[PDB]
Amino acid sequence: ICGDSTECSNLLLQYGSFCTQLNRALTGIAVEQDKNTQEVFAQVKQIYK
Amino acid sequence: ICGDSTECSNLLLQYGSFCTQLNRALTGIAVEQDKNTQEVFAQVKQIYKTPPIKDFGGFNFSQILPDPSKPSKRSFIEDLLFNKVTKFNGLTVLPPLLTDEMIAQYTSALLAGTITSGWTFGAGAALQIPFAMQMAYRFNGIGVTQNVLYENQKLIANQFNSAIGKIQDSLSSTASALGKLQDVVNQNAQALNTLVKQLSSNFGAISSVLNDILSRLDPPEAEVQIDRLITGRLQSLQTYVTQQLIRAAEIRASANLAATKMSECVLGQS
Amino acid sequence: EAEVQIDRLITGRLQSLQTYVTQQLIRAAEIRASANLAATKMSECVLGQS
Amino acid sequence: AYTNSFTRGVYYPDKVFRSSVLHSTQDLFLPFFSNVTWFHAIHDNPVLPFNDGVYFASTEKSN
Amino acid sequence: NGLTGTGVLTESNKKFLPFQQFGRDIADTTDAVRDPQTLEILDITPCSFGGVSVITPGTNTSNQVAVLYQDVNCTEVPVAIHADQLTPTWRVYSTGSNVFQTRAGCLIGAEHVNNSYECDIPIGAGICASYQSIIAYTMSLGAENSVAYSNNSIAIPTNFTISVTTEILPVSMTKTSVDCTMY
Amino acid sequence: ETKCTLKSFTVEKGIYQTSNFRVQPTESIVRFPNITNLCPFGEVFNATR
Ligand SMILES: *[C@@H]1O[C@H](CO)[C@@H](O[C@@H]2O[C@H](CO)[C@@H](O)[C@H](O)[C@H]2NC(C)=O)[C@H](O)[C@H]1NC(C)=O
Ligand SMILES: *[C@@H]1O[C@H](CO)[C@@H](O[C@@H]2O[C@H](CO)[C@@H](O)[C@H](O)[C@H]2NC(C)=O)[C@H](O)[C@H]1NC(C)=O
Ligand SMILES: *[C@@H]1O[C@H](CO)[C@@H](O[C@@H]2O[C@H](CO)[C@@H](O)[C@H](O)[C@H]2NC(C)=O)[C@H](O)[C@H]1NC(C)=O
Ligand SMILES: *[C@@H]1O[C@H](CO)[C@@H](O[C@@H]2O[C@H](CO)[C@@H](O)[C@H](O)[C@H]2NC(C)=O)[C@H](O)[C@H]1NC(C)=O
Ligand SMILES: *[C@@H]1O[C@H](CO)[C@@H](O)[C@H](O)[C@H]1NC(C)=O
Ligand SMILES: *[C@@H]1O[C@H](CO)[C@@H](O)[C@H](O)[C@H]1NC(C)=O
Ligand SMILES: *[C@@H]1O[C@H](CO)[C@@H](O)[C@H](O)[C@H]1NC(C)=O
Ligand SMILES: *[C@@H]1O[C@H](CO)[C@@H](O)[C@H](O)[C@H]1NC(C)=O
Numbered sequence: 001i002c003g004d005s006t007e008c009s010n011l012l013l014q015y016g017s018f019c020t021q022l023n024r025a026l027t028g029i030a031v032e033q034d035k036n037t038q039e040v041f042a043q044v045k046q047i048y049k
Numbered sequence: 050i051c052g053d054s055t056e057c058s059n060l061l062l063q064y065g066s067f068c069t070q071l072n073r074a075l076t077g078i079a080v081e082q083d084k085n086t087q088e089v090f091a092q093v094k095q096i097y098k099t100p101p102i103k104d105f106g107g108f109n110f111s112q113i114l115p116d117p118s119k120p121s122k123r124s125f126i127e128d129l130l131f132n133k134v135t136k137f138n139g140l141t142v143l144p145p146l147l148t149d150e151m152i153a154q155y156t157s158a159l160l161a162g163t164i165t166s167g168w169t170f171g172a173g174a175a176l177q178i179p180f181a182m183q184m185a186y187r188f189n190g191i192g193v194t195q196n197v198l199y200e201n202q203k204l205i206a207n208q209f210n211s212a213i214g215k216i217q218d219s220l221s222s223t224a225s226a227l228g229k230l231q232d233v234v235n236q237n238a239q240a241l242n243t244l245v246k247q248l249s250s251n252f253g254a255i256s257s258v259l260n261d262i263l264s265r266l267d268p269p270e271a272e273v274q275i276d277r278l279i280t281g282r283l284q285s286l287q288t289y290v291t292q293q294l295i296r297a298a299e300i301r302a303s304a305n306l307a308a309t310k311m312s313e314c315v316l317g318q319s
Numbered sequence: 320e321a322e323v324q325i326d327r328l329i330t331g332r333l334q335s336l337q338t339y340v341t342q343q344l345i346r347a348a349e350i351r352a353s354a355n356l357a358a359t360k361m362s363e364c365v366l367g368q369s
Numbered sequence: 370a371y372t373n374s375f376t377r378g379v380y381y382p383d384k385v386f387r388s389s390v391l392h393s394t395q396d397l398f399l400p401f402f403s404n405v406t407w408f409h410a411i412h413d414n415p416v417l418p419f420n421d422g423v424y425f426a427s428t429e430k431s432n
Numbered sequence: 433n434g435l436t437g438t439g440v441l442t443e444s445n446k447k448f449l450p451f452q453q454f455g456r457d458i459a460d461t462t463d464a465v466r467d468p469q470t471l472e473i474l475d476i477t478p479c480s481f482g483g484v485s486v487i488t489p490g491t492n493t494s495n496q497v498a499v500l501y502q503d504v505n506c507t508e509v510p511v512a513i514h515a516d517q518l519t520p521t522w523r524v525y526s527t528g529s530n531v532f533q534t535r536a537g538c539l540i541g542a543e544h545v546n547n548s549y550e551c552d553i554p555i556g557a558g559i560c561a562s563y564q565s566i567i568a569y570t571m572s573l574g575a576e577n578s579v580a581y582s583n584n585s586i587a588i589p590t591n592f593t594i595s596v597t598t599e600i601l602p603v604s605m606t607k608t609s610v611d612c613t614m615y
Numbered sequence: 616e617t618k619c620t621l622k623s624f625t626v627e628k629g630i631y632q633t634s635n636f637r638v639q640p641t642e643s644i645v646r647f648p649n650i651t652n653l654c655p656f657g658e659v660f661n662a663t664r
């Protein structure tokens with residue numbers, strides 16, 4: 001929403017910390033996806049041939 | 050939104066009745082959580098007390114049963130569990146309906162029932178049976194004949210005592226074994242903190258406080274600044290409510306799974 | 320100024336519509352979970368034994 | 370003469386009381402582990418640029 | 433001196449450096465202010481407020497209702513139901529009725545009893561009330577029976593009864609759509 | 616009040632939330648450090664040149 005313009009940052013400075021709020025959710029989503037696939041497949045302790 | 054300003058009400062009645070459904074949703078989720086915990090733990094109709102005489106074929110249940118020596122009547126394991134873990138600005142926190150003491154009473158009743166009466170008390174009434182034959186029934190269930198248990202009772206008792214001591218020591222020493230509860234508490238507190246801190250944002254106006262800005266400027270632009278502040282704060286409130294709804298749904302799903310697990314992996318065999 | 324009035328009205332109405340859509344999505348998801356549980360129970364208990 | 374200023378140059382940015390809380394502040398400060406110029410008062414006093422504030426460390430025993 | 437606010441003033445024991453003027457804890461919530469005339473520190477506490485709720489047995493049975501103020505002390509009860517705020521005619525409810533103090537606030541219009549039963553109207557913190565006059569007591573979990581355990585005895589049933597139970601599950605809701613231009 | 620909030624002439628057994636109360640302030644106070652001092656507008660408004 002800035003396009004590399006310090007005017008946008010200056011105007012956003014008064015809007016509060018919406019930035020971190022929208023940043024954290026995606027990280028949480030990625031973490032749970034990783035844990036989800038690891039849980040669904042990692043069910044054995046060795047490799048059999 | 051502003052803390053008891055008349056102009057706030059005058060301008061807000063022009064916007065509708067958003068607060069009605071906000072409060073409705075919050076009350077709904079509160080009642081839902083209360084019903085959730087109630088249905089998770091309310092699974093028995095009476096209260097069973099363990100007999101004072103304790104000879105369970107050599108098994109030792111001292112560190113798992115409650116004892117009448119502490120004010121809270123909490124057993125050793127739950128005491129360690131409690132010890133491991135570690136405002137008025139327009140919002141409040143309601144107290145839970147069921148306190149910890151009733152939770153402990155339900156846990157003790159269920160534990161005594163499953164030790165003494167096997168698992169028949171989950172269908173009809175409690176029926177006596179010595180512990181050794183219950184062990185034999187369980188082994189016969191898992192496919193091993195009852196002949197094995199009666200020749201290795203002492204070895205099984207020794208293994209049980211050693212294992213329970215080991216798990217108690219592991220819980221006492223090892224840390225970071227309660228990630229879920231700590232994570233939930235920390236994230237909820239963080240969300241509340243960011244919501245309450247958002248109150249001080251300028252939101253594009255010329256002042257962050259309504260009382261001062263009201264009594265220092267001409268009304269005609271004062272309504273403009275007040276409108277800016279109101280729309281910003283309302284947007285923040287809506288975001289917080291949506292987050293709360295999502296979290297409540299997830300917690301309900303997890304608690305339903307836990308209730309099913311408790312219902313079938315305790316009152317019987319899986 | 321009719322343009323400003325129109326802008327205010329439309330932004331309010333869109334806010335209301337967004338709120339309604341979000342509520343509908345949440346309720347639909349919960350109902351879907353309940354229906355899945357009911358289907359599992361019906362397929363298990365009725366057509367066999369528990 | 371150059372010297373390594375380890376961690377000096379922190380001042381109370383405001384006149385507001387607090388207690389046991391981390392506070393983040395963006396303001397004029399002396400960068401840590403910096404190069405500070407060292408001058409001797411023997412056989413001087415040269416004019417120096419101001420450039421948006423200045424630090425001054427004096428360790429002279431005699432008045 | 434310019435800093436305006438509302439609340440209750442109390443004596444404070446905190447210590448200030450000789451150059452501060454007012455303190456805060458978080459989120460620009462000024463909490464400690466020193467009076468310039470005397471140079472004495474004072475603490476600000478927000479003025480008490482809270483929600484109100486009504487407990488009724490249903491208008492069919494009767495029309496007697498008890499009132500519950502959430503998170504408020506007894507001393508603030510009479511001064512908050514005065515003849516100028518919150519339905520002045522409720523001032524009679526501010527006294528006379530036996531005021532009860534719980535962990536969920538204060539209760540007016542309900543008696544207190546030492547017994548315990550299985551109630552139907554939850555209040556909170558293990559306390560709940562019922563019409564029996566409205567009376568409030570402590571939750572009773574259920575009847576207690578002790579099973580006589582002994583290491584050479586069983587209990588075998590002799591007669592079986594069958595029963596039928598009902599369960600209800602929703603599966604779908606109303607299918608609706610909304611336009612844009614028409615709205 | 617309960618009837619008005621629920622918009623019905625009949626109410627069943629239960630607990631309902633109607634409104635909130637807040638204690639009103641009594642009087643106002645204001646302090647200024649110790650004294651007052653007058654600065655000389657006279658010399659600005661009355662000068663030789
Ligand atoms: C079950 O195990 C506990 C744990 O050791 C035993 O409790 C001990 O009892 C002795 C004798 O009274 C005390 O000296 C110890 O301090 C106790 N240990 C703890 C951790 O409190 C208990 O005696 C065992 N019971 C049976 C029947 O074996
Ligand atoms: C099966 O395993 C158990 C322990 O896991 C064995 O019991 C102990 O065995 C060790 C060495 O094998 C002995 O030093 C201990 O004295 C045993 N304890 C008891 C209480 O007997 C057990 O011997 C094993 N069974 C067989 C047939 O080897
Ligand atoms: C409600 O106010 C009363 C005062 O009228 C408080 O009673 C005080 O309680 C403290 C703590 O036990 C005592 O040290 C005081 O001596 C009590 N004062 C009096 C006059 O008895 C009471 O604690 C308050 N309750 C709440 C929940 O705030
Ligand atoms: C319960 O088990 C005990 C043995 O484990 C049975 O016999 C008891 O044995 C002890 C030890 O030799 C004696 O001191 C007791 O006098 C015996 N009788 C008892 C405890 O009643 C006992 O018969 C079994 N059944 C019961 C009901 O105790
Ligand atoms: C700092 O001073 C040291 C020692 O004189 C010198 O080696 C270094 O290059 C200086 N760095 C800067 C950034 O001035
Ligand atoms: C002014 O200062 C004197 C002495 O410092 C002090 O005693 C007094 O309380 C202060 N305030 C007044 C006079 O209002
Ligand atoms: C009130 O409750 C009684 C209980 O038996 C019932 O018979 C009666 O029909 C009820 N009346 C109304 C108006 O609900
Ligand atoms: C009943 O409870 C009260 C406290 O509410 C207590 O003072 C009293 O001793 C108890 N017993 C009787 C018989 O009143």
Ligand SMILES: *[C@@H]1O[C@H](CO)[C@@H](O)[C@H](O)[C@H]1NC(C)=O
Pocket residue numbers: 656657658660661
């Ligand atoms: C300047 O002098 C005139 C002469 O009478 C006087 O009236 C006026 O008040 C003075 N102005 C000020 C600011 O003292």
